Amino acid sequence: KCPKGWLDFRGNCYGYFRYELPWKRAEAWCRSIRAGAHLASIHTSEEHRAIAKFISQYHHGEEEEDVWIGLFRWNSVWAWIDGSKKHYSALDDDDYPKGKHCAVLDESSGFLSWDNDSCGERNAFICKCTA
């Protein structure tokens, strides 16, 4: 019983939205569009693969098509905004004092890599909710 247009994968529903919002506003929009939803957490490589395939089937702009997920940095540590425990990462985690504390799926790698972006930047986003 996933909403029309949402990905159904292993007990969860995922909604891809091309509305380009800053990270905190994207999280707020997810919570509002479906009861219990959040920016997506990703806990296995198979979940990651399914999400990338789902997004890649949509029509995109030429460039700058990164997609927010629910990973954010606070007190120097990355965590999921849905409160779930971390089990999987495709984020590089490198020597960055650049002030970029919110994660995206990177379009240039077919959403294979996660990158960190400034939380005020506008990006498309993907929501997740339990079925």
Smallest CA-to-CA distance from 67 within 109, 103, 43 is with 103
Resolution in A: 1.5
Integer Cα distance of 22 and 124 in angstroms: 9
Integer Cα distance of 81 and 74 in angstroms: 11
Is the CA virtual torsion 47, 48, 49, 53 positive or negative?
A: positive
Cβ-contact 3, 115 below 8 angstroms: no
In terms of phi and psi (left: phi > 0; alpha: psi -120 to 50; beta: otherwise), the region of 106 is beta
Tokens of 7: 């990905």
Question: Kind and range of the H or E element at 47?
Answer: helix 45-56
> Domain residues of the chain, as ranges?
1-131
Integer Cα distance of 68 and 101 in angstroms: 11
CATH superfamily of 1-131: Mannose-Binding Protein A, subunit A (3.10.100.10)
Strand partners, 83: none
Cβ-contact 111, 52 below 8 angstroms: yes
